[PDB]
């Protein structure tokens, strides 16, 4: 008491965060569920897109890259997609990003913020830091590089390397910090702060973010997947609505904005890069790629080191 | 040093898919390509000694003012390009360099395509997965070879090696089966001279969408500063050399692209990719490529066995 941890099923919320929208579709692009914000940031309403095919919703080069990608053989969990409408009004773009899971393949949006971000301009970028990060030769360098890149991009109060044990406790082993914020770094940390259900989530999805801890969730109608019959499962929807005890637990260091990023060595969870914002925080799509592609690079460099003994 | 002898950074000209302007370091413009009016509407004779300022819309004057004003690193960058004229404004796709006392701005009109190339993210995680794989040298650069390919659909991509007599070797590739192999041939170091190693040594990359391209005088072909030709080394634009033209012309391969692999200093092999037609490649694929490039370098390096 607190012991129920393990228990909360934080993968079928009903509800997303209030910053984009979600769709699910059925395989031939039925619309079969919506965020209630749907009418607002664009149509109106659930209702009336429920049941109507994507296809009639969004542009034609939407609804070709969407086809290009889902025939891509070889599964991928999703991916980025360009998405537009045009409506009676009424033509908007958003970052979009899809996913197949539970039989329905999902289509998220966000609006596009930071407002250019030429993205040329920004690749170069990320090549510099995977050069700064590749030329570390410690286990503590690369991880504070990662850290300090991590937080170059992002602009986070606080970047922290939080490494597993194998109980999965864990331990903050490199750090990367606004001089306003506490130091986290040589503090350990119980397993029970992430619990199980949790890490399994975060050892299949590696990607989370909760732009302002006190948003108010969106529900998603119908919640019920018609292949199952039952909750929509939404583990791999960016825009999950979170477990509240998490939200009470940000609140409670004055946090209001956080993202974390799993390393995965090998299939296996070593740690994450866990950031922190005083203010909310959000992200864009783009900017949380760079930050997966330095998870992935820092993952096999931990690996080569690892194996380096003997 | 026969081969070694063309002076390969002082063609005075570019190829015709882009424009290039030179400017000295208190921005006024210094020269440019020849093509300026046929993508532009102006004269070269009218921007000569003009302000960027009075040439670039002030959005662009900012990028490019706070680029070339960032400390530390960097030869050059990407950057978006629009022109103030008379005649309306143009978007570019842009990157600019420094060398030898003057700043570059190479400009590519942007893509118009019927095709949907691939994302960066997605190719580079792709293909970090898969060199991670790999448990040999061999197959490490053959899954180089294999990831360029599908993100270029170039051909023939090949991963060259350089021995100590800087002679090479095909050691991994991966082909369309519409064309030969040259997985295991070797070549004689004359086929890449000591200038141009040198140049790919701290160049590192190369494209050149159509061997049969009418080249493009840059003019004034003089440097201010420096009473020479304008050196366009780190131009990705440069006219090369046409003796490197006829050779690939003779292989009926119309479209190439070479990455250098690099390990520390040392010029350690290339990425090469070949086409039989004219191959324009995608800026962001580009970059993807030299991201892989980049990686395989590093793991050679590892699998090298240390830290000196
Ligand atoms: C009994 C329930 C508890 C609990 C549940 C819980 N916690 C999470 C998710 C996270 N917990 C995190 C822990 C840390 N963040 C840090 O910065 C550090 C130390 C440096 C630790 C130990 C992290 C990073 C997450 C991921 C989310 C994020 O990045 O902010 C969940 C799952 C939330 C969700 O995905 O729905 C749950 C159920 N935490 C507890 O302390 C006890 C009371
Ligand atoms: C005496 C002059 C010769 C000569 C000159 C030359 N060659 C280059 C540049 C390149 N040569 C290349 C060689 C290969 N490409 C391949 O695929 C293979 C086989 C696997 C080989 C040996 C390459 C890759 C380049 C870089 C350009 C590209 O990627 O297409 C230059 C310099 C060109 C320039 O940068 O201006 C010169 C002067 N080559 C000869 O064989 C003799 C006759």
Known sequence: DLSTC?????????????????????????????????????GLAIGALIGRS???????????????ALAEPGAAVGA????????????????????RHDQLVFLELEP????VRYPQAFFRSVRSAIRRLQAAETLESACAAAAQEVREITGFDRVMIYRFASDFSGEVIAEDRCAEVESYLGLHFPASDIPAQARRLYTINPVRIIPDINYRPVPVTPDLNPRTGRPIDLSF????????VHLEYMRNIGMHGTMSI????????????????????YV????????????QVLAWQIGVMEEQAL
């Open 284 to 295: 864009d799509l783009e900017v949380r790629q760079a930050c997966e592609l330095v998870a």
């Open 237 to 244: 929807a960016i825009l999950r609505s979170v477990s509240p």
């Open 112 to 115: 596009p913020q930071r407002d």
């Open 54 to 68: 994507a296809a009639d919703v969004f542009d034609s080069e939407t609804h070709n890259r969407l086809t290009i």
């Open 262 to 281: 799993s390393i995965l060595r090998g299939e296996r969870l070593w740690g994450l890069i866990a950031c922190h914002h005083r203010k909310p925080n």
């Open 80 to 99: 980025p997609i360009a998405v537009g409408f045009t409506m009676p009004d009424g033509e908007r773009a958003f970052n979009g990003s899809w996913h």
């Open 6 to 42: 393990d228990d909360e099923p934080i993968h079928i919320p009903g509800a997303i965060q209030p910053h984009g929208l979600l769709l699910a579709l059925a395989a031939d692009m039925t619309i079969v569920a919506g965020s209630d914000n749907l009418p607002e940031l664009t």
